[PDB]
Amino acid sequence: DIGKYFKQINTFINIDEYKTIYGDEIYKEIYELYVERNIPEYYERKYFSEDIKKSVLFDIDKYNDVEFEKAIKEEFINNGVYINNIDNTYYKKENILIMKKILHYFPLLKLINNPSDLKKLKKQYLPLLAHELKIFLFFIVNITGGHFSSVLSSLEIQLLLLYIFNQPYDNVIYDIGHQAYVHKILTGRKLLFLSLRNKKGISGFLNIFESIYDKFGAGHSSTSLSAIQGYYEAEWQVKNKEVDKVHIAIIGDGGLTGGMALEALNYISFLNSKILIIYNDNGQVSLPTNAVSISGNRPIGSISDHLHYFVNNIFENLNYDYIGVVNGNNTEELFKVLNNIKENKLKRATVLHVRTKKSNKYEDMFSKETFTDIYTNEMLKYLKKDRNIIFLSPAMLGGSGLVKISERYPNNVYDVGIAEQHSVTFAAAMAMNKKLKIQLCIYSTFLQRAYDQIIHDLNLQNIPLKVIIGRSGLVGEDGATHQGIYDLSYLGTLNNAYIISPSNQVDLKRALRFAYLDKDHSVYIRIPRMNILSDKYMKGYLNIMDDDNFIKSFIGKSRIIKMTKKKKVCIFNMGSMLFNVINAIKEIEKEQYISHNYSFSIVDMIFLNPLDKNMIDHVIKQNKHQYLITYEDNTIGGFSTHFNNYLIENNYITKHNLYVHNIYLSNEPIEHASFKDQQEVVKMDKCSLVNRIKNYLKNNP
Amino acid sequence: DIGKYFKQINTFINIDEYKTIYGDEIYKEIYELYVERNIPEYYERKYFSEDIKKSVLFDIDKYNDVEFEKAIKEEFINNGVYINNIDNTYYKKENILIMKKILHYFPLLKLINNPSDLKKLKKQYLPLLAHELKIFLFFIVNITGGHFSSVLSSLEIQLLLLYIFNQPYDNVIYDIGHQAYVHKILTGRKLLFLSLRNKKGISGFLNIFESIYDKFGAGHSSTSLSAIQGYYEAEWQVKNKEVDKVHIAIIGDGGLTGGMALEALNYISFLNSKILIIYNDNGQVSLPTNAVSISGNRPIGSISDHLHNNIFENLNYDYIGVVNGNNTEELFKVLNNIKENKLKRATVLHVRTKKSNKYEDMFSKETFTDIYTNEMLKYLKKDRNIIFLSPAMLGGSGLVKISERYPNNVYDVGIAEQHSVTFAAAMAMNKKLKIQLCIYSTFLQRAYDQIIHDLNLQNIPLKVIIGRSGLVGEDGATHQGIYDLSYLGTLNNAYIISPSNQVDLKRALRFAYLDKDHSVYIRIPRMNILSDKYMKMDDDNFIKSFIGKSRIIKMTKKKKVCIFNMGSMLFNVINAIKEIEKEQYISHNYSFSIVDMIFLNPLDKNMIDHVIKQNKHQYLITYEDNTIGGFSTHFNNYLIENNYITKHNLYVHNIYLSNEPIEHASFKDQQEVVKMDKCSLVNRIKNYLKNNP
Ligand SMILES: Cc1ncc(C[n+]2csc(CCOP(=O)(O)OP(=O)(O)O)c2C)c(N)n1
Ligand SMILES: Cc1ncc(C[n+]2csc(CCOP(=O)(O)OP(=O)(O)O)c2C)c(N)n1
Ligand SMILES: [Mg+2]
Ligand SMILES: [Mg+2]
């Protein structure tokens, strides 16, 4: 029985305040439908002004598998879902059965699948539907995972934008897309929601390849305003060269802190684009915000404090029509305002300030701890003796591991909001002080915004700034928007840039000890989004001093993993997926053919600038290895470039008759899936490795 | 005679308004010193409170060459100039003699060489000095080149900041650094100002390797506020772990339009950093602003409209009202009050200012940007659905002639590279329009998360025009476009075209016009089009014959060596090949072939394998106008995929721009420095051939 889960979900929701917010009649309706479980016999007549064409969910028992699959495919196509991008296993008969079992406990939600079925609900009962969605999320994101609180924050906004305006004819764009689950539910994607953030399933972000209701997809913030202005200006130019559409952008307080968002706001006002900007004010700018920083728990930004006090303001100074602070969780008042905007027309850009609420084997080779925990522990140890370490983060204190540092040394942490560019330049200016050590913690994907500051402001001036790069390699369920696979490819193009790519926690400790002791080098350390390897794995597989000796023994000193005449093949591993190479090598030697006609050596590279050419020439010229295969956890242009270019410098292929091969993550969007599945997709896992090495050995003898 | 130049400069400067701005006494002093040329005999007593220790500029005749060089080196070192970073020829005896000749015509400027010598001038005569600088720039930038109007815009700001505050103890940071010539003049670098934006001379931007008075180098806008906040927070943390110094940032209206500047402003207010922000309001946001865009000549930004409780007051800033920037007395009053007191809160001093008041035989006068403009206008004549965008670089990108004639077709977004790329991408999802984004190579470095995450990930068919690719020249290392192929080549769903001459550029433009399903990048170089003397179809046929179709330049048994050229430096390879065969040894033991590659994605492996398996070439050398990770990566990796080097006895070499800061110099000198010129090419190829036989 699943009813106990729904009862517990309802208990977790404060039902008493429903009366005060809405009214006695609304409270009674909600209590009867969702608490007393009293459903009318003809509730469709009571709650809907017109009859609704039901889905194939209620005619499932009368279908064979082939016909049922064809019918569900046609239904998804007619509701705008590009079903060919979803694996068929998802829309089978059993999955639809499970979804029906879930939806039977939702009298109004089980009968709504498209905006047309939404508009047949009586307006006065809109809060009731808003309650059902609230339970549904609590049942789905609990099982599949993803962003939760932000979805509840803007539930009424999505509901009312679907109810009132005519999408997809009218353009509506969200900012980060991690809170638009309700938008997906009422646009034809409800039945597939059990496949959230899996292989060939529903993404956690809006995608222009899932449906037509997703005008622009994003996972990086501060993008909605520019995107919606582009939509408005294109739809204005098309008519000019020959605007009944309503262009709406929903951006939160945190998103507006980003520079691109501010530029877009300024330009939207400047051009006077008839865009409604729903500023979702919720009190959260960074992740998280309750953490104590150098500026307290206050949300980051003078705009945030000004708007909280104002609850002429900033928007009015920028020549915006301002509708006062309107509750975002009140369907009545927001309905009034949005319906007025619909019936009328925007004669100038308008900001609808809205207040909302937020709080209200493979497995045996990885332990529970994370590399970021190791980073935090080392930084705490180094802070215990030296207080001149300054940490910065672009609104990612929790992910970067700085929260435990901000609590204990609040004056040592600067949370600049979503200000990657500002974070880099600020930290660089703070690193010019020889009496301070500055470490900047930023994700691999977010450094793509600040590469220009890394090059122009940090690399030209040789400023000794330490940059900690988190979430490097394959992230997992977040998707292609969060793929940290461009670190070595863009950092390796710069001089003065020491780059360290630890594979296990020991190399991470040594890299951070070097960064602590170093005072004249800009050092980047690539921390993977991965658990630390197990000690048993380190001993069995990896086979694993004063200041001057350590510094001499660390920089550019690669670690040796494994060391009719056989052909000798050496693999140069750079990155964090060395475990795949080790297991592939352990698997290959079982077969007699390769174990008789070949021998293998594995060399672990921890550096990209400078490179350990001594180890390369030890393998090439001393032990006379034949084949050379690189293995990097990065896309093209990384370690393969440096290894190939060093060999081309010295013309080793002519000298030693070397066959060369390269293995790296493919240059195709690594879609949302698990980390193991992501390894399997790019064919970089153990079995794919053994297959590829066998093919290469047996193709070039 | 040099006096005629000074007379012409005096005529070019409006001296009548000096009376109205300052007063009759100041007008009389200015007219007597600078117009009437009535210089007293003991004017140092009249104008200065204390005596000034003169430089070796007056005792130059008493020295030999070596002793004078040592003395001037010591003088430069004691005035803060890191003279070891400047070529010795710039402080020879003759250069100092010429600078002395120039300075003798400046009664007060010849006697001032450092802040200490500046503070000995009477306050009432500060306008007089402010006039001298105005002439001096009018004489030096005219000879050396660089940014001119912006320096005159903030002349009083720099002069007064030097006069009033204790630099370099107090931290003062400018935004872009193209406006700080007066700051360089009165910090010990005046004598070297003839070597402006030359090889091993003084830069056109503030550099932390030229002097201690430069606290943060610039070149990309929107950086001053973050840098000054970093300085303030470091100075605060040092004291906390154990602020008498004044932290001042001078940022203009255009600089604040950039997103990083806005974030820095918000965060400075948020943390209550005691920073004085001199908002240089001049009415100029983009380059230029008089161009007729979709919004006319109006300066870009609602902040510009609001200014030119305010926005600053809403952001919890102390606001001193609009103060004139060319009035020395009023700004002196305000800044002197700030000095005598001390900021108890972040303060924005709104200030209003004013803005308007052979190698050679192989290049013609036309620039590839002109070709781009002509082609785009020709295409606009038949189709009106072409939309152009640029981040505040209409003149440089070549869009001015497009904005003037099709104002509804151009969106000048200010310094909004990120906004420009995302805006254009969202505008490119409309299948009824063609969107071309024009952006410089270095400025595109700010727009990378949007190129990857927003444009390439969603396969949006946006055309991007990259200007100033390769070596730019006098602008310096901050403007080096040597990362286009290294960061764009890591892109699926991305066609990249790197024309070497105008014909390939026009073909790329025709493809981008006809194409409707690909994101196409075209690398226009900062170079003139090649001379026609040097060089000497339907839609489906052209599209088939263009994409991934490289061009052939030139094509005991001789060893055969082939060079794969990618980029815009093909003329160097052509001349190197023409020169190398003159020697009998190489012309007997080798034969050469040159293949011009125009595409990084998709690649013309047909031409590669034609040279590698049909004509049976032996050696392979790549040549690109880009840094590491560009074409060399793709060529080497393709050869590694097919294992051609092992099976077919290949020697491989690569020639690309060095990964070291290419300092400010001429384009020819910049080619010489990276050893990528003709003579260096012949030397390198000879060495490689004769080292691996
Ligand atoms: C450019 C960028 N930087 C950082 C993040 C990480 N991030 C995700 S949630 C968040 C803050 C969200 O703030 P807001 O816009 O108010 O969203 P809400 O909490 O209202 O959903 C941040 C910094 C991001 N998504 N994009
Ligand atoms: C990041 C960046 N984008 C573009 C440019 C090109 N650019 C040079 S001058 C200028 C505008 C300068 O505006 P403002 O800050 O008012 O300077 P001022 O005219 O006062 O010297 C621009 C966009 C630049 N220098 N930096
Ligand atoms: Mg928030
Ligand atoms: Mg300006």
Of the candidates B65, B93, B71, the one whose C-alpha atom is nearest the C-alpha of residue B83 is B71
Does ligand 2 come within 6 angstroms of the Cβ of B328? Answer: no
Q: Name residue, tokens 């990249």.
A: B496
From the number of C-beta atoms within 10 Å of its C-beta (0-12, 13-18, 19+), residue B49 rates as exposed
Sign of CA dihedral B619, B624, B629, B631: negative
Token pair of B142 as six digits: 């005219």
Residue A500 is given by DSSP the state E
Across-strand partners of A504?
none
Say if residues B187 and B264 touch (Cβ distance below 8 Å): no
Of the candidates B668, B608, B611, B688, the one whose C-alpha atom is nearest the C-alpha of residue B640 is B608
Chain B residue with the nearest C-alpha to that of A670: B457
| Calpha distance B414→B223 (Å, rounded) | 15
Sheet containing strand A466-472, edge to edge, reads A413-415, A389-393, A437-443, A466-472, A522-528, A497-500, A607-609
φ, ψ dihedrals at A126, nearest 5°: -55, -40
Say if residues B174 and B183 touch (Cβ distance below 8 Å): yes
Chain A residue with the nearest C-alpha to that of B483: A493
Does ligand 1 come within 6 angstroms of the Cβ of A225? Answer: no
Omega before B693 cis (within 30°)?
A: no
Mutate to test the interface with A, among B262, B315, B601 (most CBs of A within 10 A): B262
Chain A residue with the nearest C-alpha to that of B384: A241
Q: Name residue, tokens 């992740």.
A: A287
A176 CA to centre of ligand 1 in angstroms: 7
What residues are neighbours of ligand 4 (ion), with CB under 5 Å? Answer: B 252-254, 282, 284
Residue B9 is given by DSSP the state H
| Calpha distance B667→A611 (Å, rounded) | 32
Does ligand 2 come within 6 angstroms of the Cβ of B221? Answer: yes
Say if residues B630 and B656 touch (Cβ distance below 8 Å): yes
Of the candidates A101, A217, A207, A117, the one whose C-alpha atom is nearest the C-alpha of residue A162 is A117
The shortest CB-CB distance from A653 to any of B301, B627, B646 is to B646
Question: Cα angle vertex B606, ends B602, B612, to 5°?
Answer: 125
Token pair of B399 as six digits: 């869009």
* Chain centre distance of CA B476: 6
10 Å Cβ neighbour count for B156? 25
Question: Cα angle vertex B427, ends A280, B398, to 5°?
Answer: 125
B605-613 helix and B631-642 helix, angle to the nearest 10 degrees? 60
Does ligand 2 come within 6 angstroms of the Cβ of B254? Answer: yes
Say if residues A499 and A609 touch (Cβ distance below 8 Å): yes
Token pair of B458 as six digits: 């969603």
Dihedral angle, C-alpha B484, B489, B493, B497, nearest 10 °: 60
What residues are neighbours of ligand 3 (ion), with CB under 5 Å? Answer: A 252-254, 282, 284
Of the candidates B90, B129, B80, B82, the one whose C-alpha atom is nearest the C-alpha of residue B109 is B129
The shortest CB-CB distance from B240 to any of A223, A411, A452 is to A411
Q: Could you please report the per-residue DSSP string of B304-336?
A: HHHH---HHHHTT-EEEEEEESS-HHHHHHHHH
Say if residues B522 and B466 touch (Cβ distance below 8 Å): yes
Method: cryo-EM
Of the candidates B396, B395, B393, B357, the one whose C-alpha atom is nearest the C-alpha of residue B138 is B357
C-beta atoms of B413 and A230 within 8 A: no
Buried b (16+ CB within 10 A) or exposed e, B95-105: bbeebbebbeb
φ, ψ dihedrals at B23, nearest 5°: 150, 160
- Among the bound ligands, the one closest to the CA of B147: 2
| Calpha distance A136→A106 (Å, rounded) | 8
Dihedral angle, C-alpha A241, A242, A243, A247, nearest 10 °: -50
| Calpha distance A600→A571 (Å, rounded) | 8
Of the candidates B478, B481, B441, B465, the one whose C-alpha atom is nearest the C-alpha of residue B627 is B481
Cβ neighbors of B404 (< 8 A, separation 6 or more) are B291, B292
Q: Which helix (H) or strand (E) holds A572?
A: strand A567-574
Residue type at position A65:
D
B355 CA to centre of ligand 2 in angstroms: 13
Q: How many residues does chain A have?
A: 701
Of the candidates B249, B232, B209, the one whose C-alpha atom is nearest the C-alpha of residue B80 is B209
Q: Could you please report the per-residue DSSP string of B417-434?
A: HHHHHHHHHHHHT-TT-E
C-beta atoms of B231 and A429 within 8 A: yes
Sheet containing strand B590-597, edge to edge, reads B551-554, B590-597, B559-566, B619-624, B651-655
Does ligand 2 come within 6 angstroms of the Cβ of B150? Answer: yes
| Calpha distance A645→A659 (Å, rounded) | 15
Token pair of B134 as six digits: 């105005």
Residue B362 is given by DSSP the state G
| Calpha distance B50→A522 (Å, rounded) | 47
Q: Name residue, tokens 């990276």.
A: B674
Across-strand partners of A442?
A469
Ramachandran area for residue A34 (φ above 0: left; ψ -120 to 50: alpha; else beta): alpha
Cβ neighbors of B258 (< 8 A, separation 6 or more) are A259, A263, B221, B222, B414, B415, B416
From the number of C-beta atoms within 10 Å of its C-beta (0-12, 13-18, 19+), residue A140 rates as buried
Closest ligand 1 atom, residue A255 Cα = 15
Does ligand 1 come within 6 angstroms of the Cβ of A280? Answer: yes
Question: Cα angle vertex B315, ends A311, B169, to 5°?
Answer: 155
Report the SS3 class of residue A244: coil
Say if residues B160 and B183 touch (Cβ distance below 8 Å): no
The shortest CB-CB distance from B492 to any of A641, A667, A700 is to A667
Of the candidates B208, B216, B218, the one whose C-alpha atom is nearest the C-alpha of residue B81 is B208
Say if residues B427 and B486 touch (Cβ distance below 8 Å): no
C-beta atoms of B637 and A662 within 8 A: yes
Q: Could you please report the per-residue DSSP string of A386-435?
A: ---EEEEESS-HHHHT-HHHHHH-GGGEEE-SS-HHHHHHHHHHHHT-TT
Helices (H), A589-637: 592-597, 613-617
- Could you tell me the end-to-end alpha-carbon distance of chain A, in angstroms, rounded to an integer? 63
Alpha carbons within 13 angstroms on the beta-carbon side of residue B491 total 31
Report the SS3 class of residue A34: helix
Which residues in chain B touch residue A440, judged by CB atoms under 8 angstroms apart?
Answer: none
* Cα separation values, B307 from A261, A269, A412, B312, B350, Å: 21, 14, 37, 10, 9
Does ligand 2 come within 6 angstroms of the Cβ of B443? Answer: yes
φ, ψ dihedrals at A112, nearest 5°: -120, 125
| Calpha distance B564→B652 (Å, rounded) | 11
Dihedral angle, C-alpha A123, A125, A129, A131, nearest 10 °: 130
C-beta atoms of A259 and B257 within 8 A: no
Q: Could you please report the per-residue DSSP string of A628-696?
A: EEEEESS-TTSHHHHHHHHHHHHTHHHHHT-EEEEEE--SS---S--HHHHHHHTT-SHHHHHHHHHHH
Q: Name residue, tokens 């730019």.
A: B472
Which residues in chain B touch residue A416, judged by CB atoms under 8 angstroms apart?
Answer: 263, 267
A395 CA to centre of ligand 1 in angstroms: 8
From the number of C-beta atoms within 10 Å of its C-beta (0-12, 13-18, 19+), residue B424 rates as buried
From the number of C-beta atoms within 10 Å of its C-beta (0-12, 13-18, 19+), residue A220 rates as buried
> Could you tell which of A418, A442, A448 is best to mutate to test the pocket of ligand 1, judged by most ligand atoms within 8 Å of the CB?
A418
Residue type at position B53:
K
Say if residues A405 and A379 touch (Cβ distance below 8 Å): yes
Say if residues A366 and A337 touch (Cβ distance below 8 Å): no
Token pair of B285 as six digits: 């946001």
Name which residue sits closest to atom 20 of ligand 1, judged by CA. Answer: A252
Question: Cα angle vertex B267, ends B262, B272, to 5°?
Answer: 130
For chain A, the maximum distance between any two Cα atoms, rounded to a whole number of angstroms, is 91
| Calpha distance B349→B332 (Å, rounded) | 12
| Calpha distance B345→A218 (Å, rounded) | 38
Q: Could you please report the per-residue DSSP string of B242-254?
A: ---SPEEEEEEHH
Does ligand 1 come within 6 angstroms of the Cβ of A252? Answer: yes
C-beta atoms of B427 and A668 within 8 A: no
Of the candidates A547, A597, A602, A594, the one whose C-alpha atom is nearest the C-alpha of residue A570 is A602
Omega before A394 cis (within 30°)?
A: no
Sheet containing strand A659-664, edge to edge, reads A559-562, A598-605, A567-574, A627-632, A659-664
Sign of CA dihedral B449, B452, B453, B454: positive
Report the SS3 class of residue A138: helix
Token pair of B666 as six digits: 């001429």
C-beta atoms of B490 and A494 within 8 A: no
Token pair of A331 as six digits: 């369907």
From the number of C-beta atoms within 10 Å of its C-beta (0-12, 13-18, 19+), residue B134 rates as middle
Does ligand 1 come within 6 angstroms of the Cβ of A282? Answer: yes
10 Å Cβ neighbour count for B28? 13
Closest ligand 2 atom, residue B149 Cα = 21
Sign of CA dihedral A620, A625, A628, A634: negative
* Cα separation values, B261 from B178, B288, B416, Å: 17, 20, 11
Distance from CA of B5 to the nearest CA of A (A): 39
> Could you tell which of B158, B183, B221 is best to mutate to test the pocket of ligand 2, judged by most ligand atoms within 8 Å of the CB?
B221
Token pair of A632 as six digits: 């990097």
| Calpha distance A330→A22 (Å, rounded) | 7
Give the per-residue SS3 of B576-616: HHHHHCCCHHHHHHEEEEEEEECEEECCCHHHHHHHHHCCC
Mutate to test the interface with A, among B266, B455, B623 (most CBs of A within 10 A): B266
Of the candidates B345, B248, B350, the one whose C-alpha atom is nearest the C-alpha of residue B304 is B350
The shortest CB-CB distance from A208 to any of B223, B445, B458 is to B458
| Calpha distance A156→A172 (Å, rounded) | 14
Which residues in chain B touch residue A492, judged by CB atoms under 8 angstroms apart?
Answer: 628-629
A3-12 helix and A126-144 helix, angle to the nearest 10 degrees? 110
Question: Which residues in chain B have their C atom more than 2.5 Å from the N of the next written residue, marking a break after them?
Answer: 242, 308, 357, 536, 555
Q: Name residue, tokens 């296990």.
A: A504
Q: Name residue, tokens 């989004």.
A: A529
Residue B403 is given by DSSP the state H
Say if residues B152 and B134 touch (Cβ distance below 8 Å): yes
Alpha carbons within 13 angstroms on the beta-carbon side of residue A628 total 28
φ, ψ dihedrals at A508, nearest 5°: -65, -45
Say if residues B101 and B2 touch (Cβ distance below 8 Å): yes
- Among the bound ligands, the one closest to the CA of B415: 2
Does ligand 1 come within 6 angstroms of the Cβ of A445? Answer: no
Q: Could you please report the per-residue DSSP string of B165-229?
A: S-TTTSEEEESSSTT-HHHHIIIIISTTTTSBTSTTSB-SS--TTTBTT--S--SSSS-HHHHHH
C-beta atoms of B629 and A644 within 8 A: no
Say if residues A518 and A548 touch (Cβ distance below 8 Å): no
10 Å Cβ neighbour count for B32? 13
| Calpha distance B467→B449 (Å, rounded) | 20
Closest ligand 2 atom, residue B251 Cα = 15
Mutate to test the interface with B, among A262, A420, A663 (most CBs of B within 10 A): A262
Question: Cα angle vertex A112, ends A106, A117, to 5°?
Answer: 150
10 Å Cβ neighbour count for A67? 11
| Calpha distance B18→B445 (Å, rounded) | 45
Give the per-residue SS3 of B490-524: CCCCEEEECCCCHHHHHHHHHHHHHCCCCEEEEEE
Token pair of A255 as six digits: 């998103």
List domains and CATH numbers for chain B: 1-144 (no CATH), 148-176+220-357 (3.40.50.970), 361-546 (3.40.50.970), 551-691 (3.40.50.920)
* Chain centre distance of CA B636: 33
Of the candidates B100, B147, B131, the one whose C-alpha atom is nearest the C-alpha of residue B2 is B100
Q: Name residue, tokens 């033991």.
A: B589
Which residues in chain B touch residue A227, judged by CB atoms under 8 angstroms apart?
Answer: 422-423, 425-426
Ramachandran area for residue A296 (φ above 0: left; ψ -120 to 50: alpha; else beta): left
Name which residue sits closest to atom 9 of ligand 1, judged by CA. Answer: A287
φ, ψ dihedrals at A609, nearest 5°: -150, 105
